[PDB]
Design a protein around this nucleic acid. Structure first.
Lengths: 80, 89, 122, 81
RNA sequence: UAAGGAACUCGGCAAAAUGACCCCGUAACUUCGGGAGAAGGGGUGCUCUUUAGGGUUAACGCCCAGAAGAGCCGCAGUGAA
RNA sequence: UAGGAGCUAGCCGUCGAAGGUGGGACAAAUGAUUGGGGUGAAGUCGUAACAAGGUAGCCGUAUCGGAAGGUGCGGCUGGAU
RNA sequence: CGGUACCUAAUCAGAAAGCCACGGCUAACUACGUGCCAGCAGCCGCGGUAAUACGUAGGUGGCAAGCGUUAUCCGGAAUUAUUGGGCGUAAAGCGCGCGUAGGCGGUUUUUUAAGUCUGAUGUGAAAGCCCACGGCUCAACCGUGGAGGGUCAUUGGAAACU
RNA sequence: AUGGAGAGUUUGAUCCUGGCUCAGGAUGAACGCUGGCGGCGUGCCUAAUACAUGCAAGUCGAGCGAACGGACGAGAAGCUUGCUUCUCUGAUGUUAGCGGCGGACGGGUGAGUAACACGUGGAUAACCUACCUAUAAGACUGGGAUAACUUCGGGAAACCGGAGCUAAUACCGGAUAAUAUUUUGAACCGCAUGGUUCAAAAGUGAAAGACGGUCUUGCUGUCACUUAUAGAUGGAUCCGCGCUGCAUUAGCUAGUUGGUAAGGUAACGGCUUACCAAGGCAACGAUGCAUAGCCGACCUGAGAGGGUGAUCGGCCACACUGGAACUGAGACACGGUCCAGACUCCUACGGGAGGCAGCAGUAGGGAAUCUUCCGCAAUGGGCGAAAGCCUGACGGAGCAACGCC
């Protein structure tokens, strides 16, 4: 099989090998049918502090590597 | 252990039995794995056994045990006779 | 030695946690009490609920004084606090869950129900 | 209201837990010193390890310990040795 | 000074109890200053290590230890006032 | 002799439910008495609005009055020429 | 279960109806009693001496082993309105500015495929709802075969519109 | 596309806005009046309040010691020449124990939980799985122990606390084989990483019962045994979305967010403990308080949508209240243990016990909701070669116009 393959945008590269991407998509409203953007900070596991703030990063899910990060990095489409 | 059973449907004084391969620890009228066919004692003359015998042999070859009445149902059609030729070959 | 205005812990689930003595009943001029002596007393700290409430005047028997009793064989017994069981004017208690050790010297005062509802009697 | 089977199960679980903690403490003792004997480069660095790896699957073919904690203990000994 | 603990008494009068230092917390109400050391708690001996500040300085040393572990002893470690 | 390997029981201190206190927060019930409202029948007293309703009304604000209301200042026409 | 379901004979019009409404909504009314009293009332409202609205009696009607009241829920209610409402005076425009986030945004070309559309699967158990047969003496009910999973995910494509 | 109506009411009289009140459906309904039945359903919604009594989880002698009962070979004969005195081959029957397995399913309830609890769709190159089925390889050689029983003491008791014996498919020691594990090579992926041959060192099992035929034997069929693979099953964790009312709740966190180690878990991980770093979440509603098991479904509506969770299924949570571990494949366990607490019960006062939110039933609450019934014959479940036993699951009977026909 294969795992989910989301793409996003980093928000805060803090210390110690962790970045947090921002996958933004468009849920529709239930009753009125208006599209609305919403955000989802997905913590992910950088290998060696590679990606910097401002980059758009492709990610993939993995086994739970910590309490709140579940995802890993695969590829960086653009950076700053 | 999985075992082919009889889950009863139908009303009072009118039993209708569907035959079911299910786990032995589920309840009688509860969750099932697959529903093979039916069985109806209170019809006109027959018991009206319907069994898709291509699928009942998929369970008998990996641990399903008939329990004393579906073993009569499968023998009435002839699944249990034809079950030996997989073991004989 | 338990006289007027001594605070005693209440040693059952009768609804009281602390109680102070009004009089030591018995005779006239009777000053002190020990194990087996019935005292009339007002509860000061009461459990919310139960039977008795703060400001009731109850009768109650002394169990386990701090200055305990002497026995016929020259033996003594002493306890670390003064305790008390609220009774129901037939030498029978209010509660069913008497707490703490009870002195032996109230078996002979017809408080057998208090003994049977208690822990190990010494 | 004790059913008359459960009064026999409380008996046979005291009889069966005494045999367990005798064996289960022996497996934890025999790896407490063999992991010490992997350190210090002592004499029985190939004899106590053969005793420790022995007892941690005497207690794994029986259901004292699970067969993945057995392999986790005997890898913490034999890697460091 | 047993036991009790304001029952004394016109009235807690007197006596008792509180107190040092450090740390933690400190309410109603306010004229915003206060209240407030509110209350309420906790710690304190000695010995050995660790480094550790103030600098004393050629510095660790001189000098208060900046603090943490470890150990010892008594009923009790601002052990008296 | 039995002893060593162990093991058990016990003992030592870290974590631990409940309980003990302590000050606040929050929530609920109750409380002598209390002040507005609603509704009723009217005990009783006025006439403020509606006709330029007896001094055009109304809005904001200050003050006065037992209240209805009155007055000053500004605004409005949802008023009279 | 159970001498139960059921089937054969024997006898008898035997023993087997009430319940709420009657003004107008709402198809069913006349007469006595009572005379703002006793009382009714879902709404509007009936009663003070000729009450089709009160109380009873004869009628009639709704429908029936039930009938009526009450409680709660949805509908009627377009009285929360996306479908499908409003804001001069009926309830409703902040006393007006500057602006953050957000929402929305002129024309053309190339382009991508998030939204969008389209077709390949897989799945959204059984029971029920709808449809068609079968078994109940009919019906309730029960069983079997079908709309069918249309919510979603995986996979190709389309490129106008965001 | 078989799919949508209305009326009354502000006024002296209209139009409009606008609420109110009806006509229609349903219910776990209740109450009043009345009441032949029959068939299918349904029947504590309140107090997750307390419970008298039976009674719901047992089974296996073909795992094996004992026991007990008793036929059958049953002497001499008390001569009552059949009563057995005892003796016995003991056939065979029954159980109080040891042991295996089941007690984790079935059954009940909805208190807690706004949460990966649930629904839906995924992921596990981070997972475990007794019985069942399939495939092979095995089952060798020894040992001591302890209930029962006998004896003692405490207790009127029931059960503790001693002393000495005994058996096993109980327990334990030793041999013999692994694709486990740790060291070295050759493929492919989606980051750690996998799969499939290799090749070296250490490590680890066990059970006999009841048959058959024949050799005073030695192979043997049935099903237990344990070893390694699979399959089937059941379980676990993680993730995307979908999840009530309040902002008259706006700052929440401090193992909290990462790191590097170490332990430990079936398994990944702040899961836990050390140090290092200051992060983490939040107006897209963190947090806080309040309310509520969720869904299939059911009721209603022309739809959009609203309402509900009785019954019937799926899942979760709980078992007087709060912690904890043991046994076991599986529990941190509804008719198991330990501890703490609140109640309750027996008592010779020496210490003992119990948990109906199982099935009927009682009291209490309430407008309101039933028999202390029959049966394992059906289907299902447990233990057994099996007969069979146990099954308040279930199949039926009873009461109630509660509903439908």
């Amino acid at each position: 099989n294969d795992r989910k393959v989301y793409v996003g945008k980093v928000v805060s590269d803090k210390m110690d090998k962790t970045i947090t991407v921002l996958v933004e998509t468009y849920k529709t409203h239930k009753l009125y049918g208006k599209r609305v953007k919403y955000s989802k900070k997905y913590k992910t596991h950088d290998e060696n502090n590679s990606a910097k703030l401002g980059d758009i990063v492709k990610i993939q899910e993995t086994r739970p590597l910590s309490a709140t990060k579940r995802f890993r990095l695969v590829e960086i489409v653009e950076e700053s | 252990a999985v075992k082919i059973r009889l889950t009863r449907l139908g009303s009072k004084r009118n039993p209708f039995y569907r035959i079911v391969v299910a786990d032995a620890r589920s309840p009688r009228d509860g969750r099932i794995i697959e529903q093979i066919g039916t069985y109806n004692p209170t019809s006109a003359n027959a018991p009206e056994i319907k069994v898709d015998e291509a699928l009942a042999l998929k369970w008998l070859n990996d641990g399903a045990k008939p329990t004393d009445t579906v073993h009569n149902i499968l023998s009435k059609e002839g699944i249990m006779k034809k079950f030996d030729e997989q073991k004989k070959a | 030695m338990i006289q007027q205005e001594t605070r005693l812990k209440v040693a059952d689930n009768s609804g009281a946690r602390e109680v102070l003595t009004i009089k030591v009943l018995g005779g006239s001029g009777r000053k002190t009490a020990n194990i087996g002596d019935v005292i009339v007393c007002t509860v000061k700290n009461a459990t919310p609920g139960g039977v008795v409430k703060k400001g009731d005047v109850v009768k109650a028997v002394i169990v386990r004084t701090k200055s305990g009793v002497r026995r016929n064989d020259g033996s003594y017994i002493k306890f670390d606090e003064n305790a008390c069981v609220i009774i129901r004017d037939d030498k029978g208690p209010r509660g069913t869950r008497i707490f703490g050790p009870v002195a032996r010297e109230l078996r002979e005062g017809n408080f057998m129900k208090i003994v049977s509802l208690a822990p190990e009697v010494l | 209201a004790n059913i008359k089977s459960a009064i026999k199960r409380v008996k046979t679980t005291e009889k069966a837990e005494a045999r367990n903690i005798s064996q289960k403490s022996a497996m934890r003792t025999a790896v407490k010193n063999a992991k010490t004997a992997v350190s210090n480069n002592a004499d029985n660095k190939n004899e106590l390890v053969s005793l420790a790896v022995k007892l941690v699957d005497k207690a794994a073919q029986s259901n004292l310990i699970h067969s993945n904690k057995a392999d986790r203990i005997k890898s913490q000994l034999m890697t460091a040795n």
